[PDB]
Enzyme design. Sequence first.
Site, PDB file in Angstrom:
ATOM      1  N   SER A   1     -55.738  25.916 -25.034  1.00 49.24           N
ATOM      2  CA  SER A   1     -54.719  25.607 -26.053  1.00 49.24           C
ATOM      3  C   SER A   1     -53.797  26.794 -26.236  1.00 49.24           C
ATOM      4  CB  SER A   1     -55.387  25.221 -27.373  1.00 49.24           C
ATOM      5  OG  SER A   1     -56.055  26.281 -27.977  1.00 49.24           O
TER       6      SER A   1
ATOM      7  N   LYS B   1     -59.391  30.756 -17.345  1.00 49.14           N
ATOM      8  CA  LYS B   1     -60.622  31.566 -17.390  1.00 49.14           C
ATOM      9  C   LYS B   1     -61.565  31.147 -16.263  1.00 49.14           C
ATOM     10  CE  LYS B   1     -60.007  32.448 -22.294  1.00 49.14           C
ATOM     11  NZ  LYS B   1     -60.578  32.330 -23.653  1.00 49.14           N
TER      12      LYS B   1
ATOM     13  N   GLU C   1     -54.854  38.313 -22.381  1.00 52.07           N
ATOM     14  CA  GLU C   1     -54.995  37.730 -23.710  1.00 52.07           C
ATOM     15  C   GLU C   1     -54.490  38.681 -24.773  1.00 52.07           C
ATOM     16  OE1 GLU C   1     -55.808  34.695 -24.075  1.00 52.07           O
ATOM     17  OE2 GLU C   1     -57.120  34.129 -22.374  1.00 52.07           O
TER      18      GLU C   1
ATOM     19  N   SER D   1     -64.671  30.070 -25.006  1.00 50.16           N
ATOM     20  CA  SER D   1     -63.288  30.483 -24.852  1.00 50.16           C
ATOM     21  C   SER D   1     -63.000  31.812 -25.555  1.00 50.16           C
ATOM     22  CB  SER D   1     -62.292  29.402 -25.295  1.00 50.16           C
ATOM     23  OG  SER D   1     -61.163  29.482 -24.426  1.00 50.16           O
TER      24      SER D   1
ATOM     25  N   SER E   1     -56.292  28.835 -21.740  1.00 48.88           N
ATOM     26  CA  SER E   1     -57.635  29.302 -21.351  1.00 48.88           C
ATOM     27  C   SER E   1     -58.251  28.544 -20.177  1.00 48.88           C
ATOM     28  CB  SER E   1     -58.578  29.254 -22.534  1.00 48.88           C
ATOM     29  OG  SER E   1     -58.187  30.058 -23.650  1.00 48.88           O
TER      30      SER E   1
HETATM   31  B1  LIG Z   1     -57.841  29.338 -24.915  1.00 46.66           B
HETATM   32  O1  LIG Z   1     -56.602  28.592 -24.546  1.00 46.66           O
HETATM   33  O2  LIG Z   1     -58.909  28.447 -25.156  1.00 46.66           O
HETATM   34  C1  LIG Z   1     -59.132  27.712 -26.321  1.00 46.66           C
HETATM   35  C2  LIG Z   1     -59.693  26.402 -26.031  1.00 46.66           C
HETATM   36  C3  LIG Z   1     -59.545  25.224 -26.936  1.00 46.66           C
HETATM   37  O3  LIG Z   1     -58.725  25.276 -27.871  1.00 46.66           O
HETATM   38  O4  LIG Z   1     -60.357  24.312 -26.737  1.00 46.66           O
HETATM   39  C4  LIG Z   1     -59.340  28.385 -27.638  1.00 46.66           C
HETATM   40  C5  LIG Z   1     -59.273  29.717 -27.824  1.00 46.66           C
HETATM   41  C6  LIG Z   1     -58.802  30.768 -26.796  1.00 46.66           C
HETATM   42  C7  LIG Z   1     -57.528  30.213 -26.158  1.00 46.66           C
HETATM   43  N1  LIG Z   1     -56.394  30.012 -27.042  1.00 46.66           N
HETATM   44  C8  LIG Z   1     -55.650  30.889 -27.738  1.00 46.66           C
HETATM   45  O5  LIG Z   1     -55.847  32.100 -27.688  1.00 46.66           O
HETATM   46  C9  LIG Z   1     -54.460  30.350 -28.616  1.00 46.66           C
HETATM   47  C10 LIG Z   1     -53.166  31.249 -28.621  1.00 46.66           C
HETATM   48  C11 LIG Z   1     -53.091  32.574 -28.194  1.00 46.66           C
HETATM   49  C12 LIG Z   1     -51.838  33.202 -28.283  1.00 46.66           C
HETATM   50  C13 LIG Z   1     -50.904  32.393 -28.758  1.00 46.66           C
HETATM   51  S1  LIG Z   1     -51.490  30.858 -29.177  1.00 46.66           S
END
Ligand SMILES: *[B@@]1([O])O[C]([C]C([O])=O)[C]=[C][C][C]1[N]C(=O)[C]C1=[C][C]=[C]S1
Length: 260
Positions: A211, A47, A140, A104, A44
């Site tokens: 993440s 973004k 996503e 996020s 993320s």
């Molecule tokens: B994205 O990466 O951002 C986070 C941020 C954090 O954890 O601080 C959290 C939620 C949205 C994002 N992550 C995911 O969607 C995890 C996964 C998606 C598909 C496979 S694992």
Amino acid sequence: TADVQQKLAELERQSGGRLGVALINTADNSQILYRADERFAMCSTSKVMAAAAVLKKSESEPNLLNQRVEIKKSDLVNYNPIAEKHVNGTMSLAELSAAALQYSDNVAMNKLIAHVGGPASVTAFARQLGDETFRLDRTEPTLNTAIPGDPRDTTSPRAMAQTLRNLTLGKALGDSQRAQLVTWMKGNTTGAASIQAGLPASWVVGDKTGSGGYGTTNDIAVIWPKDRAPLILVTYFTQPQPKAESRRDVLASAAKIVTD
Ligand SMILES: *[B@@]1([O])O[C]([C]C([O])=O)[C]=[C][C][C]1[N]C(=O)[C]C1=[C][C]=[C]S1
Ligand SMILES: [Cl-]
């Protein structure tokens, strides 16, 4: 410092994974780099680029941020903390940007991606800025798989630090748009255990975490230390096991090492 390098190597060793760091110190135009040219899954942290692309578009379409976007059940994905509250109504592009950056929200990111024309359009925006490393390949939730060896949805710490600097402190965006990006990042709710956790409490931080699979744990930040020129810091981390747990502490430790 060679000392800083030794400390980052020690941290990586202890962590069991692969750590990427790029710090830009605008006081003296110096950098601290560790695996800063290797690729990492952005998750993320991507973004920021998508929100920036919408902000850029808004410079030639002044009522763009107020434009309404329908949220349906069919839009929901894996993590929808804000969008789930708006199903069957609309959100503005400003609200989607805020949800993507501060919570996020993954639906919000998909609406930003779609609006600007898809992952290839977000990537072309990066290129227009001078970032020739960033690539957004997927939407996503699949962009977070973070499979080792897979270049999809990756960038380098060096590139992302230089780009975040341009977006938040430089002139990539018009003054209104830049200020809006900075305000959104300063209001992030997801980063208190990451870079922020390795800095003094008095410092001001705007950040975006990420993440994903392989225990990938990321954060990118603009930082205003007390009475100092600002810093830009990228800390990317990923692990060998597909189901590895999150390691926000590793990012906090990296931040403390490079700012001590
Ligand atoms: B994205 O990466 O951002 C986070 C941020 C954090 O954890 O601080 C959290 C939620 C949205 C994002 N992550 C995911 O969607 C995890 C996964 C998606 C598909 C496979 S694992
Ligand atoms: Cl403190």
